[PDB]
Amino acid sequence: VSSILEERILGADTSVDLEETGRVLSIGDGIARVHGLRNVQAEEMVEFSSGLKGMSLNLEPDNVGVVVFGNDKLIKEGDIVKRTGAIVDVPVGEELLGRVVDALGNAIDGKGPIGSKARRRVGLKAPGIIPRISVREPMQTGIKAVDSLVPIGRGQRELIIGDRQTGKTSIAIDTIINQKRFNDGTDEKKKLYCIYVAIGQKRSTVAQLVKRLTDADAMKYTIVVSATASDAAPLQYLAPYSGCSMGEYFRDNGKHALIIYDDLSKQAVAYRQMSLLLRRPPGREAYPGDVFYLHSRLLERAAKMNDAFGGGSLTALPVIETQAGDVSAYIPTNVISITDGQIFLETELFYKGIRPAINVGLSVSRVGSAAQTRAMKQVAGTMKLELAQYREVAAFAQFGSDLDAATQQLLSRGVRLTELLKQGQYSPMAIEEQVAVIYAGVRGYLDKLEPSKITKFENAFLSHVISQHQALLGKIRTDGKISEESDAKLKEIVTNFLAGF
Amino acid sequence: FAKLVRPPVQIYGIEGRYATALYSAASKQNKLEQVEKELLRVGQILKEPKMAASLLNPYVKRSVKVKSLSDMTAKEKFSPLTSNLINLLAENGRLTNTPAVISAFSTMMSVHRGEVPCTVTTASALDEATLTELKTVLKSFLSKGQVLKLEVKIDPSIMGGMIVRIGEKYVDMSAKTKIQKLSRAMR
Amino acid sequence: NMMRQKEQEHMINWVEKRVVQSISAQQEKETIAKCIADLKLLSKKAQ
């Protein structure tokens, strides 16, 4: 093996340089107070002698407050900090796809090193007002509720907000898995290069996640950044920008990306620690004054460039955890007033059996009708109106009888639609199968079928349409509308099938 | 307020403010060199056991300390600037850190006359002919006029080569760092 | 794999520990001359 390690030695850079330098005055809690570094740019990567990094965050008149990228056990008052001249930057490209990188783009997967050629800053500005063009394409998440009632176009920030253990990461992972059908096909105007930033999670959780993605063979197009719970505060404050830059590469390279921060309410906590230790003035809930600028300058990179800047895109699905439906806390409102929507998840719905536990009453998308295909648009308009009518008179549900036949009809329709929206886990469905199911649901081809059985029907119907009438589904998919011929054919399939069951 | 001439180097804290004030006031009236002489003198004059003992007790009325400083500064016959500075420090109560002031002022005058700090940490003992070549080559880094004030230091803790500091510029060619760099690169 | 990982991770430590005691020889003059040349080059390229 020694024959192999001598090219390891040869492939080095032994040269030295005349570099600037300061000396640590203080250290503790993860915050060095370097003295010197007279020509240090704000937000620049300095290197301590022992080997760590640091990001010279707080240029005070006499000393520079640097934040160590790791345990400062290795640092002592007296050490030498040598500046590098470079703002924080990270590798990018398509070499990352399928890897697992940490906050600074260093493969923590073993599995060899990253072979990226091009690097890129992390503190770039979002594209202006002219580069963008209106949000028009849909991002099929593969989830019935999300994909019909609260649509998600490409280039749109869509908060996924909800209490703990309601199925937020599950929605994001179903979204990631669904893109397989696109990323295996041919057209390059439908390929989504998912990214998944894992902040504050424990490495066991990220490991299980990458196991899910590998089982579903959904890593060949996914990057998985990870600033896990044990990584010092700066590496969690900085992971979302690493992810967003890895995605900006695609966006400005005429490709379509998708980035999922999980959570952002832990990047905010990491930044609060970084600030409170640097002694910056606190504010409400102890967050600094930048905890809006922080997120805003992040969730405003998710754009949809026009056709002169390439036509790329970058969706964004920040996951937020709210303490017992306290949507009025500081961070939930900071990140609810930046994004274009919200997919609210609730635990009353998760245990009633409505999984995914989406709460269509509170969930909205501010693109709306656009960001849907004409087929799903036709179906979901009526579905949305019917569900809205149901919700406002669901209070009588516990009675039902003793009431007018009109509200009895409304309940007998809303119940079926609610049961149709229930979905499995890691079982996303192509748009045309969603259209088929919800067509069979909203046109009355179940009102006479007892609610308890609807789920059965659903699955059965799918298996009876996937393996039988693939031609019809292809007709619906290739041109995303229901031409009267396709409408009547769907009616016949639904009716005759229901008859034989 | 009145325009004041900034020092060449900036020192910060209490000593920073006092040294900057004194340096700017001395630059006017051009009494810098004699001011530094008097500062060195007060250095020792404030280390005699009786003076250094009565200028730490906080139960000596402030006016008593100010008057004793005035009397001592008559005998030593200081310039008006230095006597005024000693007074000032006396009644602001900040004379406990007089050594910080003068020291800072020295660093403020050294850079004024242009003697950049330097340093050469060596792997082990060093010859003096080697020191001659070292000085003659480091003089290649200065600007046109500066002077070199090299403080050699022996260090066997490093492995080989040397570490050279010049002002801030820090060049590290010690074999130790080469070893850790190589191990890092090939790990 | 496991055997190769063990082998290489021991090779590296063994040889580096040999080197950290091999440097104690008397090659000082060569190092000093090389470093003075490096000063020459840095000063030249530093302006």
Binding site: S3, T14 | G160, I179 | -
Partner: peptide, 22 residues
């Protein structure tokens, strides 16, 4: 290329420890 003392020292030591295997 020949200037490096400690680098090529590491290389020579690796050759020597390579021959030691066998």
């Amino acid at each position: 290329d020949p200037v490096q003392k400690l680098f090529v020292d590491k290389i020579r030591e690796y050759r020597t420890k390579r021959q030691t295997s066998g």
